[model samples]
Target: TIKVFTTVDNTNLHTQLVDMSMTYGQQFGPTYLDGADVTKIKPHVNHEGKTFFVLPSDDTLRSEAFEYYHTLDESFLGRYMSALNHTKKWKFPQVGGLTSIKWADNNCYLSSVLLALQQLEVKFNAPALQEAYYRARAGDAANFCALILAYSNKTVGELGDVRETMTHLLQHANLESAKRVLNVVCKHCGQKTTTLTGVEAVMYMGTLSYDNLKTGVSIPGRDATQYLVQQESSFVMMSAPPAEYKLQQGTFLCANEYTGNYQCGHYTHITAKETLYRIDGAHLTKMSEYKGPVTDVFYKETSYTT
Candidate 1:
């Protein structure tokens, strides 16, 4: 139930990023820069004025990490303190030659080169880079969720899809990653809860107190009774100062007089509602504050249950 702050958008995407980073690092190693080679690897034409060199070899991870480091891109020379074992085994020059004049104007090569170099920089400084990567990752999710207002823009509703987000954090987040995220959520809400489902029941504040009821005795009916009694179910409730926050169906409506022949007078149906709830007044903020920030909460911590 420890809370932490992080910048992972959802558990799936969070896991994707983490898995991608780890796999990319393991598979390709750190990518390095090669400004000089970048210039040489420009798109140009041949003697016949036909398009040639359309894409450069520098566009891929291989070219940037190994190929460009030694020969073509002198800037990446000697950047790696480790033995060039991967390069040595491959027997491919860490540089690209302009042998194929026909292959001109190749933007893929150029882009790959840049990405490879960026990845290398990211790997070299994993800690700092991780913070930045998670920030951006969170931004991406926030933007996507924002399309549907996935998260609450305000502190109170920060955990818009908390359960999903937490699941994502658990799947992708490292030990510290989930902690960093949940901490932020706990800080804002006086109490927090964990679980991927049953949130409305968990947050339900017991009986209607007469004020909540529009008709009837306003006492606890089966509907209200279910929420109040079942709130203690592990699937629902959590102690205050919530160690975690999760997404659950937050809104429900018992068949009131307004129920225009919908079905049974006591209609009970649960559907995934995409309404983004945050502390009031946070619907329009940028993706970073709500979506991005929440990633940290769910992804940074280690849940005791999971």
Candidate 2:
């Protein structure tokens, strides 16, 4: 008799069964794996005068497991870029008549504005201005204006345009007019500055251009230029590097390129040491180096397990 026992953790039992199918070509009863109420399904049965339990076929279990795995294989970068297009809808309070207020003495407003400026610095290295824009957009119009003023010297770029543009408005444009354009653009995209969502704010920023603005300037920052260069290099390393190169166990692997998406330039470290695994007819064997046909290796470790 074979006895099979299972333990349940935080993950649902259906997912666990799928995982088991991937690691070990094992299957369970379809009804048991479907997450149905235990009282609704028969757990035991009699077959050909012998007692037996209904279970999922091996092919059925493996097919479902692969389907679940492929569903999660969609690109993280693609989803992030899609999310950036809807920043203006994000939630925030409204600040009316901000241009008329004496902002310097308003501690709450001043603090929020200053913090927004600092947050802009964090995203300055990449095209990730959504979060910073959200912080300012959530505040009064004065806060949004403050963001424009602060980042005017910083860079913003459209998709595919390698040249960086300074986030400033033209010198001849009046502040009130500029504020009007900002408000209108933001509203047209979606949400009120005080009431808009972060999603809406970013969407508004994405739609902006020199043609739409009455006053706007584009001046490249040295830091921004250098950041783009670094981004390109990392992109090449992650996307186009030669596959046969032997890397040390501790080498760093840049996994994504900076492409205006948040957390785009990220890396993973290789921890596994060099090792070889071989298949001998029906069995798998591990080795420190390659050997000859019967000794032919089926797999090699490119990363450290540690």
Q: What overall lDDT goes with each candidate model?
A: 0.21, 0.24
lDDT of 1 by residue, 114-228 (tens): 1122212112122222333343233221121221111112121122232332232222223221111111122344544332222332222222121121122212313221111
Cα lDDT of model 2 by residue, 1-306, tens digit: 222232111111333322221212233432212122222333232211222222224555334433322222123222222332222222233322111112221122222223223222223222223334444545533323333333333211212110111212112112111111132222233532222222121112211121222233222323110011001010011122212223222332111112123322111111122443322111233445432211000011121111
Alpha-carbon deviation at 187 in model 2, angstroms: 18
What's the lDDT for residue 271 in model 2? 16
Q: Model 2, residue 105: displacement in angstroms?
A: 50
RMSD of 1: 22.1
Return the top candidate by lDDT.
2
